[PDB]
Every structure is written in structure tokens, then in C-alpha cells.
Paper text:
Finally, crystallization and structural analysis of cp-mKate154-153 and cp-mKate168-167 revealed the expected tertiary structure previously reported for mKate, with only slight variations around the permutation point. A. Cartoon presentation of mKate (pH 7.0), cp-mKate154-153 and cp-mKate168-167. Each region tolerated circular permutation, but fluorescence varied markedly, with most efficient permutation sites tending to occur within the central loop regions. We found that circular permutation of mKate enhanced green fluorescence in several constructs, augmenting absorption at 442 nm. Future studies will be directed at determining the structural basis for fluorescence variation in circular permutants of mKate.
Here we report the systematic evaluation of circular permutation sites in mCherry and mKate, and the development of highly efficient circularly permutated red fluorescent proteins (cp-RFPs). We performed a similar circular permutation analysis of the monomeric far-red protein mKate, which derives from the sea anemone Entacmaea quadricolor and shares structural similarities with mCherry.
Numbering used by the authors:
A (entry chain B), B (entry chain A), C (entry chain C), D (entry chain F): 1 to 132, 136 to 235
Amino acid sequence: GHLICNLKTTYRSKKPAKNLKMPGVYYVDRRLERIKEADKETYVEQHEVAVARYCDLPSKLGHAGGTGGSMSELITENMHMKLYMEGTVNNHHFKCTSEGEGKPYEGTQTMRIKVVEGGPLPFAFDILATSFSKTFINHTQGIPDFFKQSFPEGFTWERVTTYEDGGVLTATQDTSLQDGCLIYNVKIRGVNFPSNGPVMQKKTLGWEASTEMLYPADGGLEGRSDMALKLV
Amino acid sequence: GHLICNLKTTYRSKKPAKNLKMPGVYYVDRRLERIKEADKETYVEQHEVAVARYCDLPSKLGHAGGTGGSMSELITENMHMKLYMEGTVNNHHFKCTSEGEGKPYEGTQTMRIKVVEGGPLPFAFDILATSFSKTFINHTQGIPDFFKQSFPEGFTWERVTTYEDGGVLTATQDTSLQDGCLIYNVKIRGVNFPSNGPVMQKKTLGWEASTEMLYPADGGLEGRSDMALKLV
Amino acid sequence: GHLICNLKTTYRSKKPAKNLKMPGVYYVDRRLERIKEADKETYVEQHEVAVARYCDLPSKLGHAGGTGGSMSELITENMHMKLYMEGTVNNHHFKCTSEGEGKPYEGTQTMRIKVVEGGPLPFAFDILATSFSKTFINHTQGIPDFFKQSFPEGFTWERVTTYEDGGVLTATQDTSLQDGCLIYNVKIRGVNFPSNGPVMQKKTLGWEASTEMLYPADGGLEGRSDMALKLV
Amino acid sequence: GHLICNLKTTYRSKKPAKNLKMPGVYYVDRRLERIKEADKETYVEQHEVAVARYCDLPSKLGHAGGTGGSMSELITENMHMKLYMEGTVNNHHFKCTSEGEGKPYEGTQTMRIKVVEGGPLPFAFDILATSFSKTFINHTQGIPDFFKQSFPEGFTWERVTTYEDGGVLTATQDTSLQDGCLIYNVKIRGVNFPSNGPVMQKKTLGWEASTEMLYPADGGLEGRSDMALKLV
């Protein structure tokens, strides 16, 4: 079976608004997969593929179009990332680091992750999966790319993930570009994960594929998604 | 801008489970549009197109795959529907009726709707849109069709829609097939819609396209979606 | 153990706003218990004691200076109630009728309840308990009584109760005064109660005491409370 | 008017459970007040009074009894506190320190608070108020005191506060006793506070009084409350 959660996210550019070409309401389809783990999840490799689309269904009210996408020459066909993460789930403190690479225009990426403090964690690593990369979304289908456009200044995101069994996980993130490398700094605070639930019992088996709806809200973007966590 | 809401739905077949071929986790993309309205929304025409898909992104872990879709000869390529709806929003009681037709395998359908008691309504008709038809989803991409398979016995759905400004709308529905016509009986109970919000002030302009995730669960299938209501 | 739910309620007065005397933010302490049950919960007896208080704690800021309590000549020291209930929980349809007597100023009332239709219920009767009487709250500590003041016109209430395991029950209610008897007409719509949860498994044993915070909002009052359902 | 929020808290003792006398379900009534502020809320003085009670309404079960309260001589009639706080709201990072004193058995306390980093804050200080002391609750009315009993080992708490306009604030806290002084270490992570809302616009004026319901949940206590934030 599955345990469901809901994500509510706000994405904020550090680039002045007058310099951003904004998208309309759009959708990002994703498949985030665990590729490898070692030593009770103190080492994890994750891969994600993410493709943006405007709704392609026919419209009876007429197609409202745009002026195609955006350009961001600071973001190359191949990019590397480095990440630092710190936080708490329930009463348990931890730190992680990761490094990876991907193809920002093709929407694919890999992260190799180490738990460097607080390991092994008392909770399923799956609940951290979405906190490890918005620059790697394929927006080539004519959608202005809020994320790639944000450079050199970069952007932040902030999110609340609400699990249907009481766990709540907030996360805040800073994304910068430094000497050609993307740098992520992430902070996590999760609370009220049930002691008898699959997260604290480590009885999860990764995420199903997902769709996120993104929409303009106050100069930035907000996102909404429901995700399904596979259970043992 | 937009007002967001979240849908949590349980779909229950009246057909014995041993006679149902169940789908895996899948997604339905929709575009529900208002085609016409008259006399302050006491007459409304709605159209929907709905297309089911499994995740089509490549997988690194390779997938189980499926054994194809299902067959349901009772559901013809053209079908008619009749609907009766009764309920309350806040303190306001009302009844609606509708009739329509569509193409269940192509995923398209039209409803022509009349408010027959309690009109004109003091709230935006848009909050009733999703309560007016699961037999009309295109599952031809090889996804077993829980809804079409449920006939002749039929199925029910029950849903809570939670608006981000406090409105909550529950609905329960019975779907039957009588003399070749689909018959819908729907009951609505909405509460706490804010007096100063766009619903009670009638400042809404229809729904954005949406994606619903459906998965085998408590009962038959459960569904999750977030929808974005356009604002004046 | 306990199962926890949250109540959000809006109370609307039929009587014009100008006529009504409005209370400051205040809290109602309630103990609701089931005196008797029979025939698989087909017949239930419920007793409620409700007392209303302004905060009794000392204030350094020193805010108080209430103009005093309201007068409701229409409401006698002893009052009688007749109730009609129609509801659906999940896919189940039921009808309930009740007759009761109480001392409104005292804040004590007794209800004798019969399940006319759909008995025996497949779900715990406990979820229904809140739905079955705001006129019977002791406001004699100088708090203007929004409910007693509403007569002869009467009032409505509307509520969503959200259970921490997914059940959601909305209810709307009309309160009138006819030939000296209080008349309640209530409508219930519950959805998504888990098949493996204590409500559907009938493993509950009544409610703990509660406190509701009430505050002026838009037109009338809104209320917020959390309640704890005892488990077997 | 008011902006409402909901608090869900888990309280965990660091003392072995076989050394704790647990309370039954109970209620804590509080009045938290701002006494002084200076320099755009970069200095704040807060006072709280908190009194625990079992329900004191009569029962028809007439079946309620307890062994009375508990004893904790490490907690003296007067106690001092020192606090360190760090966190983020939306995209804004900050740190605070405080020191104060109180009467743990009378349920009163005062904290003098400084914003030491990230001041002045772009959000209402009110949203941090509940993160600055459970040892100072008057449980003298025969209720076992989970918090006072936890010493010398101490306890933690973790909380999610959900505002009805989208703001979500999680907090985690460690409480220890060091050389006779209570030491608090608090971490805050708030997200999605609306730019047009009273928190980000600094249009708030403190909290109404509140009641928290506490109940045993898996070796420790859980708490539930709704709080009302006064608006300008």
C-alpha cells in the first residue's frame, strides 16, 4: 500500500522581477528513484527525471498562448552540484552532504548523499528525498524557466510536507551558483512523525511518480503536489 | 491570481472485487471548462476532457509493467447521463438537475445544468463543478478501468475538498446504469466558506487544468488532486 | 488510547445583527456522556453539561469591563427539544430522530435518540454525538448569549470535524422555536473514514471533556475545539 | 478581528517511563501577554500564567478518580531560565536569546527577550511567542506533573502551528536543568506566511487566552490547542 503526503511550496527568485519572464500555470512530472543505498541508509544515491509541460489537452475556450521560453547561458548542458543539509526530525538531529551532476535541459540528475552526523537515522531516509534541485527541470517545451533565469543571483524555496498520519516536515533551501557549480544549503525540521508509523519503523520503499502544479503568486511561483510513499 | 483547494476522494465499486482487474498507481489529466451560463449561473453548460496515463518518464529501476487494460461492453462509445443534486453550502439549500452526453473512451463529456431550487445561488457555481463523472475517462493507454468495469452494478464516490481559505465541501455520489443511461445522484455539504472570500463574493473565473493521482487503497481507489480556481 | 479530531464551526443568527448584543472572545467547557445504549446503538441516550466562561486568569494588561449578560425571556428555565437527522457517512445512509429536555440557563440537557433509518449503523455512534444544542449553555457569568438572543428567529450552525486518521464529517443545522418547543433539523455528510480505524470497527467508548473557543467573526460567532475519542 | 491557528505538540520525557507517574487527560488554561517592547520588536518582555485542571464539571458516569499529583523537589518555588533560539521564517534567518524567572508551582513566569541576529524581523514577533516553558504550569490541583517529574533528565517538545491563512511554523525544543537553572534550546522553521497577511505586514496585537488539551500518547504527552491572534 501507500502513505500519502501533500507538498506546499513557495519558490522565490533573488533576481529582480523586472528581469524575469514569467510562465503561466504549468505542471512538472517527476520520477525520483533510489538507485543505491549502503549501511542502513548512511549512503544513498538518488536519480530524478523532471519534465515541465503546459496542459496539452484540447480547450473548448481557445488556446491562450505565450512567447516561447527563456534563455540562461549561465546554465550549461552539464552541471555539477554540492549540497549541505542540517536539521531535526522529531527529537533527532542530523547532517548530510551530497554531490552530483545532471543535464539541466534534459531534466535529469543524480545525487550521491552521505549522512555525516546523527547516523544511522531513526527514520526512513525517504522523507528527506525531496529536499536534495529545481534547476534540473526540462522546460524546453516553450515554458519560461523561472529557475534557470534566476542566475547569477539564484533562488530559494520553502516547503511544508504534510503526511496523512501526522508527520509534518518543513524545509527551507538556498540555491546559489559559485564558480560554475550549483551550491545548495538546506535546513529541515520535521515533527510529530508517529512512533508506530512506517517512517519511524523504516517500512518504506520509495516514492511513486508525481505531478506538481506550479503557478505565479506574488512575483514568485508556488507549487502543489501529492506524493505516494510505497510501504513494506 | 488563484485560490487553491485540495481533493481527497474514495471510489468504491459495487461489483465484487473478484470480478475487478485493478490498475496500478496512475494519473488522470483533466480540463474542465465552463462553456455557457445564463441568468446568474442558474443555467450552466460544462465540458470536461479527461485522459488517464501511467508515468511515461523513463525508469532506472525498470518497472513491473502491466497486463494491459480492461473491457466493458456495457459502456458504449456514446453514452447519455442524467443527474440529480441536492445540498447546502453554509446555510443555503439548493437542488440542481442536469443531462448530457459524451464519449467515454475518448474521455469527453458535456453537461447542461439547471439550478431548480434555491436559485440564484449566493456562492460561485465553480465550487460545484467537480460534483457533476468518472465513467468518461480515456483509459485506452492500457490502464485497467475501475469505473467502466463496475457496471452493471455501478459505483460510488465520496470526497472532501478543502479550500485554502477555510471553505470545506464534502460530496457523496451514486452512479448507476438504468436502461442504457448513466444516472447520477449527488449530495453536497459545504461549510465555512468565508463571507469575504472569492466564492461567496462570486469573483471566480473557472478552474485551471488538473492532475489527479489514483491508487489502490481503502475500498477500491483513492484519489488526490490540488486544483487552482482563477480569480477576478 | 485516544483518537483526536478538530472542530471548526460557524454560528449564524437569523436575527438582525444590530439587535444582538455580542460577546467578547469566550470559552465553553463541555462534558458529553452517553447515559444509555441499546439494540446495537439503535437507541442512544445523551447528556451534556456546558458552561461558558471569560478567561478567569489574572491579566497584567488588565483588559476586563464587560457590559454584562443578555436577557432571553422567550427561553424558559425548562425547555423541550425535537430533532430530525438525515446523514450519509461514507457510503451509508441513515435517518435519526430525537426528543430532549434541558435547563438552558443551567447548561444541562438530555437527548433520547432513535435511528429510524439505516440501523444498525456500520460506524460508531460517537461521531454523531456533537450534532445532536447551543441554546443549553450556561452563560450566567455575565456573557452575552448569542444563541438565546437569536429567538424568536433562531439560528444555524455549520461544522467540519476532521479526524486525525482521515475521516471528515461535515454537518449543518437549523434551530427554530415552534409553539414553545426547540426544533432541530440536522444534516450530516461524513467521508473517508478508514475501514481499519476505530470508527468503522466500532472500537470507541465516548468522548473526553472539551473546551471550545468562540469568537466574533464576520457576522456571528466562530468556534474551534479539539476533542479526544476514547478507544477500546 | 482575529487570525486563528492550530497547535499540535508532542512532549517527550528524557526520564525512563517506569519512573514517571502519568496524568489522565487534562487541560491547561493560559494567558500569555506582551508586557514591553522596544526597537521594532528587537526587545520584548513576555509574561505567562498557566493553570492545569481536570474537567471540574459534574459527571453522570460519576466515575472519575486519581491518586492525586506528584512531587519534584529539584524544581523550587522560584526558578530562573536562560534560552537560545535560532531559525528561519520564510526566507529570513534570525537568532534570539532570553532570560527570565518564574514561580513553577503558581504557574507564572516572565521572559526578557533579545533578537540578537537578523533584527529587526520582517514578521510579527507574536508568531514566536509560544516558543519561549512547560515547567511553569500550576498542576497543584491533583494532577501528576509530567514536566516537573522529568528532572533531572529533562524533556523535549516538538510542535507544528498551522495558521488559517497558510503560514506553518514548526519548532523543536530541548529543556535541561544545569546548576539549578532551566536551560532552553529552541529551533524554529516557519514557511509560507503570506506577504499580504497580518503576520508579514506586522498588523497583530498579541494573543487571546487559550486552553490546551493534553493526553497520554505512547509514553509521553500530546497537546492540542487553537489560538486567536488579535488583528489591527
